Amino acid sequence: SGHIKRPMNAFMVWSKIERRKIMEQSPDMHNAEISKRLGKRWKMLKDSEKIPFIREAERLRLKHMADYPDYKYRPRK
DNA sequence: TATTGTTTATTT
DNA sequence: AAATAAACAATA
């Protein structure tokens, strides 16, 4: 459609993988509960444990700049 | 139907 | 200038 999406931050990068894991082990589980539990877990994670994901987001961000150099975030009502 | 981090938009 | 609001990325 032409709309350029926001880069995934570290929490989104981690959430994708962990949501997939919870889905594989515990299917038939509602997405709101999964988000609540993922938020709690992420808040418990040590900063160092978060390093791979943070950097990964940054990597994606760099790619975003290369793919859409004229891009700026524009939230609209 | 919810979550965190990031950015812009709005109100103070 | 600074506190607050609000949009939004992936996903069942």
CATH no. for residue A11? 1.10.30.10
Q: How far apart are CA A53 and CA A2, in angstroms?
A: 27
Q: Which of A25, A24, A23, A46 is nearest to A35 (CA)?
A: A23
Q: For this experimental structure, what is the resolution in angstroms?
A: 2.5
Q: How far is the CA of A43 from the C1' of B1 (A)?
A: 22
List Cβ neighbours of A38 (8 Å cut-off, separation of 6 or more): A15, A18, A19, A22
Domain containing A51 equals 1-77
Number of domains in chain A: 1
Method: X-ray
Q: How far apart are CA A35 and CA A18, in angstroms?
A: 10
List Cβ neighbours of A34 (8 Å cut-off, separation of 6 or more): A19, A22, A23
Q: Which of A23, A72, A18 is nearest to A45 (CA)?
A: A18
DSSP secondary-structure letter at A3?
A: P
Q: How far is the CA of A29 from the C1' of B7 (A)?
A: 32
Q: How far apart are CA A19 and CA A53, in angstroms?
A: 14
Nucleotides, chain B, CB distance < 7 Å? 1-10
Q: How far apart are CA A7 and CA A32, in angstroms?
A: 22
- Is the distance from CB of A47 to CB of A54 less than 8 angstroms? no
- Nucleotide closest to A35 measured between CA and C1': B3
Q: How far apart are CA A69 and CA A28, in angstroms?
A: 41
- Nucleotide closest to A6 measured between CA and C1': C9
